[PDB]
Amino acid sequence: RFLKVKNWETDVVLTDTLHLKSTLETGCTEHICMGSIMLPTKDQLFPLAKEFLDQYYSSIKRFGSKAHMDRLEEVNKEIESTSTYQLKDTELIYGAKHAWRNASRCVGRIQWSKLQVFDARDCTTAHGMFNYICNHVKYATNKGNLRSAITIFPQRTDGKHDFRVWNSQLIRYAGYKQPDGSTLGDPANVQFTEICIQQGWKAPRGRFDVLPLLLQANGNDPELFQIPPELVLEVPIRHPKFDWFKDLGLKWYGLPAVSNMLLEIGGLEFSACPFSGWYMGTEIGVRNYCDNSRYNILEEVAKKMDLDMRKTSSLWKDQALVEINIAVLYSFQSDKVTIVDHHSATESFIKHMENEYRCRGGCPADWVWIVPPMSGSITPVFHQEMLNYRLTPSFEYQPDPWNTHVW
Amino acid sequence: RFLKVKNWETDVVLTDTLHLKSTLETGCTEHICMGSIMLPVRTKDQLFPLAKEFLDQYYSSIKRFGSKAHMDRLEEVNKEIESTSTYQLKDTELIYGAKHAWRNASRCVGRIQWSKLQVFDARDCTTAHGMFNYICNHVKYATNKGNLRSAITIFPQRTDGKHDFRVWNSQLIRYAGYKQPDGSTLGDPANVQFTEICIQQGWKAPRGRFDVLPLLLQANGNDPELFQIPPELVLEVPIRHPKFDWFKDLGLKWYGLPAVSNMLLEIGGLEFSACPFSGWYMGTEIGVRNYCDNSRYNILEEVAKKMDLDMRKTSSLWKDQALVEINIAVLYSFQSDKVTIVDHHSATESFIKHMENEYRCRGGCPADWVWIVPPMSGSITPVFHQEMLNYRLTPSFEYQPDPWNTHVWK
Ligand code: HEM
Ligand code: HEM
Ligand SMILES: Cc1cc(N)nc(C[C@@H]2CNC[C@@H]2NCCNCCc2cccc(F)c2)c1
Ligand SMILES: Cc1cc(N)nc(C[C@@H]2CNC[C@@H]2NCCNCCc2cccc(F)c2)c1
Numbered sequence: 001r002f003l004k005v006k007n008w009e010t011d012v013v014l015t016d017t018l019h020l021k022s023t024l025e026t027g028c029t030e031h032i033c034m035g036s037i038m039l040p041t042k043d044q045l046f047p048l049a050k051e052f053l054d055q056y057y058s059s060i061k062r063f064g065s066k067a068h069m070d071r072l073e074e075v076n077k078e079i080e081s082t083s084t085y086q087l088k089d090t091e092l093i094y095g096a097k098h099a100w101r102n103a104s105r106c107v108g109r110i111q112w113s114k115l116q117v118f119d120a121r122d123c124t125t126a127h128g129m130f131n132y133i134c135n136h137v138k139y140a141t142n143k144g145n146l147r148s149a150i151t152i153f154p155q156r157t158d159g160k161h162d163f164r165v166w167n168s169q170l171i172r173y174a175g176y177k178q179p180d181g182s183t184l185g186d187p188a189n190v191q192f193t194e195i196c197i198q199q200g201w202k203a204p205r206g207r208f209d210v211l212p213l214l215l216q217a218n219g220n221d222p223e224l225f226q227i228p229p230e231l232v233l234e235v236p237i238r239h240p241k242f243d244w245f246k247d248l249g250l251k252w253y254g255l256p257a258v259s260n261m262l263l264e265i266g267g268l269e270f271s272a273c274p275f276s277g278w279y280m281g282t283e284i285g286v287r288n289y290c291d292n293s294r295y296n297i298l299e300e301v302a303k304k305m306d307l308d309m310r311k312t313s314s315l316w317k318d319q320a321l322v323e324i325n326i327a328v329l330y331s332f333q334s335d336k337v338t339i340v341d342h343h344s345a346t347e348s349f350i351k352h353m354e355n356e357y358r359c360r361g362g363c364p365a366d367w368v369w370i371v372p373p374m375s376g377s378i379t380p381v382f383h384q385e386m387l388n389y390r391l392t393p394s395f396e397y398q399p400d401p402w403n404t405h406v407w
Numbered sequence: 408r409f410l411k412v413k414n415w416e417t418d419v420v421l422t423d424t425l426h427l428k429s430t431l432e433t434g435c436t437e438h439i440c441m442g443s444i445m446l447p448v449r450t451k452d453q454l455f456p457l458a459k460e461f462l463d464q465y466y467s468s469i470k471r472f473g474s475k476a477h478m479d480r481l482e483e484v485n486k487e488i489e490s491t492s493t494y495q496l497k498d499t500e501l502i503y504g505a506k507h508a509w510r511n512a513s514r515c516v517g518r519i520q521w522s523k524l525q526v527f528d529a530r531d532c533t534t535a536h537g538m539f540n541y542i543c544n545h546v547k548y549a550t551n552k553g554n555l556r557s558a559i560t561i562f563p564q565r566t567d568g569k570h571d572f573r574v575w576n577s578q579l580i581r582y583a584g585y586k587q588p589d590g591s592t593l594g595d596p597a598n599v600q601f602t603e604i605c606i607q608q609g610w611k612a613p614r615g616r617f618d619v620l621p622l623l624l625q626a627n628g629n630d631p632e633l634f635q636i637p638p639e640l641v642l643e644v645p646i647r648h649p650k651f652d653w654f655k656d657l658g659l660k661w662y663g664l665p666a667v668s669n670m671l672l673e674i675g676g677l678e679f680s681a682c683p684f685s686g687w688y689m690g691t692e693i694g695v696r697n698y699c700d701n702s703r704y705n706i707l708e709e710v711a712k713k714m715d716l717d718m719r720k721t722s723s724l725w726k727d728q729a730l731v732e733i734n735i736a737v738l739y740s741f742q743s744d745k746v747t748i749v750d751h752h753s754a755t756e757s758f759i760k761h762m763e764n765e766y767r768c769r770g771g772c773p774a775d776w777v778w779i780v781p782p783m784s785g786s787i788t789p790v791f792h793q794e795m796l797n798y799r800l801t802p803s804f805e806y807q808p809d810p811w812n813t814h815v816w817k
C-alpha cells in the first residue's frame with residue numbers, strides 16, 4: 001500500500017505515499033494496463049467540497065481551526081440551499097495551482113506555484129470572454145518573456161449554460177482540404193476551420209492562418225472574434241548552419257495556450273479555463289512539424305539536406321529530425337522568446353519529482369507523456385519509474401463541443 | 408467485453424477480445440498504473456488446471472480440441488501429476504509452448520518472427536559441461552556466419568526448486584566490466600558485479616574494454632561452473648561510420664548475437680529456469696542504449712567532441728546529433744559485414760503489421776508501449792501513435808532474480 005519508484009540510471013529509490021490519496025479511476029485493472037490509451041448532485045458535491053477545503057486548510061496550516069470549521073459550515077449551508085457554492089479567491093488560486101501540480105502528463109510542473117490566476121467568474125458574455133482572453137494573451141506573452149497564466153470563467157451550473165472556448169488552443173493555424181486531395185495548413189484543424197467558415201470567417205487560405213476564437217458564454221451559440229494580430233507573437237524558423245532553411249516558409253506561434261480542458265476544484269467544474277506556459281522545443285519541432293498527420297515536413301527537409309532517402313537504415317528521418325529541432329530552438333532563442341529544450345525540461349522535472357517526493361510524498365507522472373518524442377533514453381525521465389494516479393483538483397480533457405451542442 | 412485501441416495517425420481502430428483469456432496480474436489497479444515500473448515447487452492443486460488450460464490451447468491450435476488424442480493426453484497428464492507430482496511435455500508441446508511464450512511477450516517489437524523459432528530440446532542435459540556444449544551449438548547455429556537465425560535452448564524444468572538449471576549470465580555473450588580504484592569503469596559498467604563473481608570463480612580477466620565474459624552454468628542446483636565460449640564462435644562487428652573516417656579510432660565493436668539467458672519460460676504450469684533464446688538486434692539497442700546510456704559505455708561526449716559540435720549548451724542538441732551518427736555507424740557496420748540487424752523504422756513498421764494481423768486472426772496482441780517505442784526518434788515511428796493494451800498471457804517469459812542472490816552454495 002506504500003510503493004517504491006526506482007531510477008535505473010542513478011539507483012535512487014523513492015517511496016510513494018501520496019497515491020493513497022487518489023480517488024478517481026485510472027482505466028487500468030489487475031488484468032489490463034491501459035497506460036497508452038489517450039482517453040482511458042447535492043449529495044455528490046459536499047464530500048467533494050469537504051475533501052478540497054480540508055486540504056486547503058491543511059496547506060495554510062489551519063487544519064481543524066475555527067476558520068476551517070466555519071468555512072466547512074458556510075459551504076455546507078450554501079450547498080443545501082443553492083445546490084452549489086462559490087470558491088473564495090484564495091481557494092480559487094490554490095485550486096488552479098494544484099490542478100497543474102497534479103497534471104501527471106505535464107513535464108513543466110517545477111513551475112506549478114508560479115501561476116498567475118485571472119478570475120473571470122464575473123464574465124457574462126462572449127464579448128466579455130474575448131476581452132479576458134486578449135488580456136490573458138498579452139499578459140502571458142510579455143513581449144517574448146513568457147509568464148504562466150490561467151483565466152477562469154464561470155463554473156458549470158445545470159450544464160445547460162456552460163462557458164466554453166471552442167478552440168483547442170487560443171492560438172492555432174487553420175487547415176484546408178484542397179481539390180488537389182491534399183491539405184493546406186494544419187491538418188489537425190481542418191474540421192474546426194470549416195466550422196469557422198460556416199459561422200462567417202473569411203479565411204486568407206494560407207499555410208499559417210491564425211484561427212479566430214469561437215467563444216460560448218452561458219450555453220449560448222458561440223461567436224467569432226479575431227485576436228488582435230499584434231497580440232499574437234510568432235517566430236519565423238531559420239537554422240544557424242543551413243542558409244536554405246528559411247525558404248521552407250516555416251513559423252510557429254510563441255504562446256502555447258490550452259483552452260479545451262475542464263478544471264475541477266472542490267467538486268465545482270470550470271468548463272472554460274484557458275491556460276498557458278511556454279513550449280518545450282520538441283512539441284513544435286518533433287510533433288507539429290514531423291507527425292505524418294501534421295505539417296509532415298520530413299521529406300522536404302531531407303531533400304534540401306541531400307540525404308539518401310532510398311532506405312530507412314540511413315536514418316535520414318532521424319538526421320532531418322534533429323536539424324529541424326535545432327532550428328526551432330535557435331529561432332526562439334534569437335528572438336528572445338521563452339522556449340525550453342527537452343534535455344533541460346526533463347532534468348528540471350527530475351528535480352521537481354525529487355522535491356515532490358521529499359515534501360509531499362509523491363508525484364503522479366505519466367511516463368508515456370513525460371518522455372519526449374525524440375531522443376527518449378538520453379533524457380533522464382526515460383530511466384525514471386513513475387506512478388500514475390489521478391488527484392484533485394485536476395484538469396480533464398473534454399470532448400470537442402460541436403458534437404455536444406444544440407443551436 | 409470488447410476493448411478498442413486507436414491509432415492516432417491513421418484513425419484505424421482495433422477491437423481486443425484476447426484480453427479475456429488473460430489470467431495473471433499486471434501490477435496496475437483502478438487507482439494506480441504501474442505501466443512504467445520495470446518489475447511490477449508448486450502444488451498438484453494448481454498444476455493440473457495450468458496443464459489443462461495449456462493442452463486445451465495446444466489441441467485447439469492443431470484443430471483437435473475434444474478429439475480422442477486430446478482427451479487421452481489430458482488423462483495421461485492428470486495421472487502423471489497425481490503419481491509423480493509433475494509432468495513431461497511432448498516435443499510438439501514444447502515447440503508450441505516456446506513459440507507462444509515469444510508470441511505473448513508484450514515488450515518484444517520483434518514478434519512478426521514468432522513462428523520461425525528453432526527449438527533445441529536440452530531436457531536430457533545433466534551437467535554444466537553438458538549445458539556448455541548445448542549453448543555452444545546454439546551460438547553456432549544462431550550465428551550462422553552472420554545470417555542470424557532465431558533459436559531457443561530449453562534445459563530441464565524445475566522440480567523442487569532445489570535442483571534448478573540456471574545460466575548465470577544475463578546474456579550468453581556480454582562484455583566484462585571492471586570498477587577501477589579511482590571510481591572509473593573499464594568495459595561495460597552493467598556487468599561489473601557478474602564480472603567480479605567470474606573472477607572470484609577463477610576466471611583470469613584480460614582487463615580490457617571488450618572482453619567476452621565466460622559462461623557461468625548451474626546444472627541440477629549444483630554450484631555453477633566457468634566455461635569460455637570458443638572465440639571463433641563469437642561473431643563481432645567493429646563499428647565504423649560511412650562518412651566519418653575517425654569513427655573507427657574510437658575502438659568500438661559489438662557482438663552480433665543478442666541471446667537472453669536469465670529469463671524463466673512458463674509452459675502449462677511447468678517452469679524452465681534455463682532457456683536461453685536469441686534473435687538479432689534492432690540497431691538502437693546498441694547505438695542508443697549500450698553506447699549512450701550514462702550508466703553504460705557513455706560515448707556521447709567523446710563522439711560530439713570528435714564531431715566538434717557546440718557542447719556548451721544542451722539547446723544546440725549536440726547529444727541528439729551525435730546520437731544519430733552513432734546509430735548510423737552501427738547499422739552501417741553490421742550491413743557492411745553482412746550481419747543481420749534491423750533499424751528501428753523497419754522494425755516498428757513490421758510490428759504494426761504484425762499487431763494488426765494478430766487482432767484479425769487472434770483477437771488481440773498484448774503490447775507494452777513503454778518498451779515497444781524505440782529509445783530515439785519515438786514519434787517518427789508508427790508505434791508511438793499506436794494505442795496498445797498490455798496484459799499477461801501464458802505460455803510466457805518472466806524475469807527472474809539473479810541467482811547469486813538466491814543460490815545456496817554447496
Ligand atoms: C510553464 C511551462 C510549461 C511547460 C514547458 C509544459 C510542458 C508540457 C508538455 C511538454 C506537455 C505534454 C503535452 C503535449 O505534448 O501536448 C504538457 C501537458 C500538459 N500540461 Fe504542461 N507545460 C507548461 C505549463 C503548464 C501550465 C501553466 C499548466 C496549467 C496551468 C499545464 C498543464 C498541463 C496539462 C493539464 C497537460 C496535459 C494536457 C493534455 O492532456 O492535452 N502546463 N505540458
Ligand atoms: C528476431 C529478432 C528480434 C528482435 C529484433 C527483437 C527485439 C526486441 C527488443 C528491441 C526488445 C526490447 C528489450 C530491450 O530493448 O532490451 C525485446 C524484448 C524481448 N524479446 Fe524480442 N526480439 C527478437 C527476437 C526474440 C526472440 C527469439 C525471443 C524469444 C524466443 C524474444 C523475446 C523477448 C522477450 C521475453 C523480451 C523482454 C525482455 C526483458 O524483459 O528483458 N525476442 N525484443
Ligand atoms: C485526444 C487528446 C487527449 C488529450 N488529453 N489531449 C489532447 C491534445 C494533444 C495531446 N498532445 C498533443 C495535443 N496537444 C497539443 C498541445 N498541448 C500542449 C500542452 C502544453 C504545453 C506547454 C504549455 C502549456 F500550457 C500546455 C488530445
Ligand atoms: C530489471 C529488468 C527487467 C527485465 N524484464 N529485463 C531487464 C533487462 C534489460 C531490459 N532492456 C535492457 C536490458 N536487456 C538488454 C537485453 N535485451 C535483449 C532483448 C532481445 C533483443 C533481440 C533478440 C532477442 F532474443 C532478445 C532488466
Ligand SMILES: C[C@H](O)[C@H](O)[C@H]1CNc2nc(N)[nH]c(=O)c2N1
Pocket residue numbers: 035036037038368369370415791792793794795
Ligand atoms: C498512443 C499514445 O498514447 C499517444 O501517441 C501518446 C504517446 N505519448 C504522448 N506524449 C505527449 N507528450 N503527447 C502526446 O500527444 C502523446 N501521445
Ligand SMILES: C[C@H](O)[C@H](O)[C@H]1CNc2nc(N)[nH]c(=O)c2N1
Pocket residue numbers: 008382383384385386442443444445777778779
Ligand atoms: C523506467 C522505465 O520503465 C525503464 O527505463 C524502461 C523504459 N523502456 C524500455 N524499453 C526497452 N525496450 N528496454 C528498456 O530497458 C526500457 N526501460
Ligand SMILES: [Zn+2]
Pocket residue numbers: 028032033034035435439440441442
Ligand atoms: Zn496501467
